[PDB]
Structure 1
């Protein structure tokens, strides 16, 4: 698909058996989702941007479906204001910026 940028580029994702809405964010290195359970070990991490830093849990090897496209990678979980699909998963679904 081709997604224009007149509006926020929100899509439906499936993660951990749950449907969520998430923002396709080329400015985010990583992927961060609001509080939810995920399988496996985790380690704490600080992520930063506008407004400063938040503490998240880093889970690895998390299978995800983004607008119908499956991708595996690290997913961060914590008090993000918005669910965010970052570059680590955008690459895997073949997403590019074009102009």
Structure 2
């Protein structure tokens, strides 16, 4: 779909079998999801944002549906203000910025 930006680009995602709401974020390199239980092994990683750096759990090759679109990639789980779908998965669903 074509999504305008008058409202936050929020969509329903399905991860670990659980439905969640996430923000399609072109300004995010990666996909960061709020702390949750996720099946699989993970490795400690640190990411940055506008206010600084936070520690997250890096889960690789995670199956995730984004607005009805399937993606299999890295999902960082940690204390993010918002669940955000980053470029690693946006590219997987063929998302582009247009104007």
Q: State the TM-score, normalized to the length of structure 1.
A: 0.98
* Structure 1 counterpart SS, 2:88: helix
Describe the superposition over 1:3-58 as per-residue Cα deviations: whole angstroms up to 9, x where unpaired: 00011000000000100000000010000101111122111111002000110000
* Structure 2 counterpart SS, 1:97: strand
Runs of at least 5 residues in structure 2 that lack an aligned partner in the other structure: none
Describe the superposition over 1:51-70 as per-residue Cα deviations: whole angstroms up to 9, x where unpaired: 00110000001000000000
Q: State the TM-score, normalized to the length of structure 2.
A: 0.98
* Structure 1 counterpart SS, 2:28: coil
CA distance in 1, matches of 2:28, 2:48: 10
Give the CA RMSD over aligned residues.
Answer: 0.6
Number of paired residues? Answer: 99
Moved over 4 A (4+): none
